[PDB]
Design a protein around this ligand. Structure first.
Ligand code: HEM
Ligand code: HEM
Ligand SMILES: *[C@@H]1O[C@H](CO)[C@@H](O)[C@H](O)[C@H]1NC(C)=O
Ligand SMILES: *[C@@H]1O[C@H](CO)[C@@H](O)[C@H](O)[C@H]1NC(C)=O
Ligand SMILES: *[C@@H]1O[C@H](CO)[C@@H](O)[C@H](O)[C@H]1NC(C)=O
Lengths: 681, 681
């Protein structure tokens, strides 16, 4: 019942019932410039104009170098038990212990203003405002990353982002430079496959799993440690769109995911995730056929099962997007007592990069003093001055060691003051090198494991995604280099992808082929645990009392927890949205109300209120994109017009009571994969 | 025939055949981090990692506060004569006098990653690198602006920009706050009408007119002066898409306009505009029924006809987008000898705003020293120091007046040194006042004049635009305020828009009704003067020798200057694009090659190589959006399947010879408006 943003209330400003003022006080007006005469030039002495305009002119700050496009919200994490047996972290140190949290979801390549539903790796950054400092798990919705060394990050990001000569294409990897890098740097192949699957185009932020990706360390009070992988398990269930749907949705509504997250929290349907961890000993570093320090590899659950530690729930939206969401500054270096890093070369470089990049975004050192960045545990140190210094320090002896300050602020370590400490057992041994380990060399085995662990239709989506993006590559040799690398993962994949490009795939390379499968890498395979907050489009008409029983259909669906929108020609009594403003991409299921066949047919389907064939296009798109479709009573003729029979799965024709039962259980399936063709008939 | 970017060659860096280096020199490698042991931690002493990563972390600069999304290219302006009789401007001082130029086109509301095909006002900024300093004409594609005073600019943008709590919606005025401002501030209504018309969703940057909007002054040698309006008249002709087309295009290709401009210049089809002016005497400032200081008004051509001065041709794309296009700093305050400002309250505030805003973007006062911002005429003054000072000044006596420097750099004015001078005749008179003139009061007459001067179908698109956007407003009273303001402009428009909102705004308010009409405001009325660079989608298939007919059809079509693309199931010999990658929005005309009917029906229409019903949707979308469609020989069956007549206007069935001609004639018509329904059918 405690507010998640309670600490931020002191900095909130209410402008209701007030006069307009300047930033230095004093009441004013700001609707007229000061002029020298009735039709005169504007005066330089006009201080009210310049102070207003100066602030407007300096509103924009630099966007994030990566993950510029994103959205977030506040929440509460609750620990299920006392985890002192495995870690000294205070936020996991007791049963029912609650910690405030802020989570920001994002894409990667796209700039600010780009579409939510573009194919990309997604961000999953979570902060724990704990009683021993801020702890951040900066992660993604895919358990492996492209590159093995952090020094290669600019090379990866330059290649995937728009071509520097024309800045094209926007928020897309479907171009020469991206697929040049994937083929030239074959370690990226694994994350490529995840990005080409359902994880590239998820339904929403709520329907994503999250991963810390890197192997971290969890340290106890006595110094003993264990290797750990972070996992966020979605309670809303995993769900993904189709690509042809995602493209249209990008233009129809670029704010799809952020508005979805916003509407969920406002409607009283706060999304939740369970924090889980894979715990293994130090001596299992190179035990399971790969190196745990390698970020391009994940650990199958068959070797180490998930151990649930707690649950996070996001229940408070921000009041100002910029001040909270845009200004927040996540860091993987934000670590607390009880946790420790590993020698993962990609992770190692991130610790520097995130702290450095805040100097560019916030244009100063004092970015942690911002309300959203502030901890709840207190800040006491000899840091002075800097740009935008918000506090006034009382200790005039800002140094250590010192007699004058009486040894305060004091030093804290493992035994005293509950201070951070590196794992005492950690050792370094060997020559100083600019090399990668020989255990990092395998780039093809896990990609094959991931591809094998998908369903036949899910395997088709990945191949169709590669076909689409690879066909945009103009350079012939680059496409040959791509098929060469795909052939090392799988010959059948390389064969099928080569068909679209009009090239001959190379002969089988059986070095890295295998028939192994792994658990829990699938999406369109498992049904959703709840259909709450899912969207239904009720296609109705203003003419002939069709809207009256469409409202009854809407009323019944809302009881089960569904978000319903009644569509008509114009905004009549009961109509939520017009056909002009309506699209199939904004719904999980399209239902044709009885008496609404007139808008699919001759006279009625060609009204000036909406574009030609708009009602018919919505139902057609919905069916082709695999959504549960329906048609009540005599509305089954609407299905007959588009050419869809009333027998096939995911199509529900009949009485009002039967349609509701069929549509609701159809939403659990979400996508019906039998409507999508597989290679070989 | 000189290179427009000739001066930029000196700062160009070629990295071909060279070894990798740091920014301070010395050859290096940068693909492995320096580790302490084989699987050890990364060392802090690794200077190669940090210097590489630091530059990456600090790559981004703040986007423009408005007009963030844009693109540009270099060119040459050619004056048609000696214009010393009207202006003292050097670049207009002789016949066939060439001056380098850079032009950046843009939207307004959307952020850097937003779509080109969003409905918005479009920027038209042009710089003249003259031999007497840089001269900028920062303009739009619409001749009138929303507000009358520049102090209200933050209020206008804040309302149209995304809502501050959730940052929704992106690149759109279709929300509560925007229409709340338009109704509360009636001055905005005029530009709204232009923004709701074809000017809101233009075909490309090449198919836009440009306007300086403000009344400026042209000054001669002896101090004599004339009021002037700047006009850019396109040689490519005006063209605009439909709304339903632009939405899908925003998702399919967000880089539509910038790729269009890039491909045009790259293919040797450089676009051109004519610089024209409307010259009015000083004593006739308030003679034409409105105040020429009012930015919300435009002057009809029948009162003051256009006088062409020269021609601009953009024929050199940039080599680095960031260095040239992103970094260029336009300002209306960039004025030269022979031009002067007026008492337009909106123009007055811009002079301050544009200079101040560069301090945010560039983080220093030396932004003019950037190669793209540098003038060709030279810089000599007493300005020293500042952030990123790139020069080393030799004059130690950096002040005026002075004996030690002998009075150099020297003062220049009207009579000596060809310096800048304010128009001698300009005067100020009256009380110091924070108010607008009584002559600025009319907000409803010209909006009606614009609506009257459009064609029946164009008038429908404007109403359909208002119908669409007004329905997104959730607040009932705001919609009532909108109709109340629309009713003042036109009763029929208010009533027609009201039916979509599901309420009455009936009772006529005829204070401002009239039937006057003016030339040149319409887009869809005129035919295109050229069909060069216009795109044609050739729907073909890989089976049954249909690709040979498409290849023969391609050459003859591209012979006449068109940009053809052959569509197929996969990349065959003569295939340019796959069906999976293809969409109707990328083409101006669609044509089915002979033998390619199989892909529209039965088994050929359902392949795993492309989404279900893709070939049919491309032809359907093309037809529905008023494009010229066609089919060769037996290909007429493709048109038969979608329910389209062979006879009707813009549809061309028959032999290849009779298809090539007709489609080329149809592209001159561009859009067939008879396919769109009008109110009263
Ligand atoms: C698997 C490893 C990685 C993960 C899980 C990851 C994830 C993320 C996420 C989620 C964000 C957005 C944070 C937010 O919500 O604001 C982000 C931003 C960023 N990333 Fe990474 N990324 C990884 C690799 C890297 C690497 C190797 C580098 C370079 C050393 C890097 C540099 C950055 C920087 C500079 C930002 C901007 C941070 C800010 O402006 O606050 N990332 N990353
Ligand atoms: C009178 C009609 C106006 C027109 C035609 C216009 C045009 C433009 C254009 C074309 C740009 C982008 C320039 C580029 O290509 O880089 C721009 C940006 C900008 N505008 Fe305006 N504008 C108008 C009114 C205003 C007003 C009244 C203000 C406030 C006083 C204003 C403030 C700005 C600012 C601060 C920028 C960013 C400048 C930069 O970062 O380089 N504009 N405008
Ligand atoms: C922690 O600091 C104390 C002094 O405050 C010191 O005696 C002790 O050795 C330190 N702990 C360890 C384990 O190094
Ligand atoms: C596949 O799984 C088996 C488990 O029986 C394991 O022994 C083997 O190393 C895995 N990899 C391959 C390529 O067979
Ligand atoms: C145009 O119509 C206006 C009505 O606002 C009228 O005042 C004016 O005399 C007309 N001018 C002409 C003749 O074009």
């Amino acid at each position: 019942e405690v507010d998640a943003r309670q600490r931020l209330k002191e900095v909130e400003v209410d402008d209701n019932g007030q006069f307009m003022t300047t930033d230095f006080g004093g009441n004013i007006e700001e609707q007229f410039s000061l002029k020298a005469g009735g039709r005169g030039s504007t005066l330089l002495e006009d201080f009210i104009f310049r102070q207003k305009l100066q602030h407007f002119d300096h509103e924009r700050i630099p966007e994030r170098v990566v993950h510029a496009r994103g959205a977030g919200a506040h929440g509460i994490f609750t620990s299920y038990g006392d985890w002192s047996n495995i870690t000294a972290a205070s936020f996991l140190g007791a049963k029912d212990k609650q910690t405030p949290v802020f989570v920001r979801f994002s894409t990667v390549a796209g700039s600010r203003g780009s579409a939510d539903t573009a194919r990309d790796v997604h961000g999953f950054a979570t902060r724990f405002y704990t009683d021993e400092g801020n702890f951040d798990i900066v992660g993604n919705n895919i358990p492996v990353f492209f590159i093995q060394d952090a020094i290669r990050f600019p090379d990866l990001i330059h290649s995937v982002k728009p071509s520097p000569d024309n800045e094209v294409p926007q928020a897309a990897t479907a171009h020469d430079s991206a697929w040049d890098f994937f083929s030239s740097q074959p370690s990226a192949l694994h994350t490529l496959f995840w990005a080409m699957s359902g994880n590239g185009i998820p339904r929403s932020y709520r329907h994503m799993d999250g991963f810390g990706i890197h192997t971290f360390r969890l340290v106890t009070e006595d110094g003993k440690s264990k290797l750990v992988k972070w996992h966020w398990k979605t309670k809303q269930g995993k769900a993904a769109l189709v690509w042809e749907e995602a493209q249209v949705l990008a233009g129809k509504n670029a704010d799809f995911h952020r508005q979805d997250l916003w509407d969920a929290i406002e409607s009283g349907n706060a999304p939740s995730w369970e924090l889980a961890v894979q715990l293994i000993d130090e001596d299992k570093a190179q035990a399971y056929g790969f190196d745990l320090l390698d970020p391009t590899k994940f650990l199958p659950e068959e070797f180490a099962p998930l151990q649930v530690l707690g649950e996070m729930t996001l229940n408070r939206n921000p009041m100002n997007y910029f001040a909270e969401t845009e200004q927040i500054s996540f860091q993987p270096g934000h670590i607390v007592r009880g946790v420790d890093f590993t020698e993962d070369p990609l992770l190692q470089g991130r610790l520097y990069s995130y702290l450095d990049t805040q100097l560019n975004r916030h244009r100063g050192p004092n970015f942690e003093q911002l309300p959203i960045n502030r901890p709840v545990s207190g800040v006491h140190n000899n840091h002075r001055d800097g740009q935008g210094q918000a506090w006034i320090h009382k200790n005039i002896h800002h140094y250590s060691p010192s007699y004058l300050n009486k040894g305060y602020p004091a030093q804290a370590n493992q035994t005293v003051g509950r201070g951070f400490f590196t794992t005492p057992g950690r050792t370094a041994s060997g020559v100083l090198n600019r090399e990668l380990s020989a255990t990092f060399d395998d780039h093809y085995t896990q990609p094959r494991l991931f591809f094998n662990s998908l369903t036949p239709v899910e395997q088709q989506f990945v191949i169709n995604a590669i076909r689409f993006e690879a066909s945009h590559v103009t350079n012939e040799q680059v496409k040959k280099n791509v098929l060469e690398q795909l052939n090392k993962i799988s010959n059948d994949v390389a064969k099928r992808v080569a068909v679209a490009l009009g090239l001959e795939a190379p002969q089988p390379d059986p070095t890295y082929y295998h028939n192994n499968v792994t658990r829990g890498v699938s999406i369109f395979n498992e049904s959703l645990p709840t259909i709450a907050t899912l969207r239904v489009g009720v296609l109705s008409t203003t003419k002939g009392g069709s809207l009256d029983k469409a409202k009854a259909l809407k009323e019944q669906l809302e009881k089960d927890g569904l978000k319903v929108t009644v569509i008509a020609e114009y905004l009549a009594s009961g109509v939520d949205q017009t056909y002009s403003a309506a699209d199939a991409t904004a719904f999980d299921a399209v239902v044709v109300a009885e008496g609404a066949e007139r808008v699919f047919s001759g006279k009625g389907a060609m009204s000036p209120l909406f574009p030609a064939g708009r009602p018919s296009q919505i139902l057609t798109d919905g069916y082709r994109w695999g959504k549960p479709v329906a048609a009540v009573g005599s509305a089954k003729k609407a299905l007959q017009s588009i050419g869809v029979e009333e027998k096939e799965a995911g199509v529900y024709a009949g009485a009002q009571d039967e349609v509701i039962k069929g549509v609701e259980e159809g939403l659990k399936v979400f996508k019906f994969l039998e409507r999508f063709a597989v290679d070989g008939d």
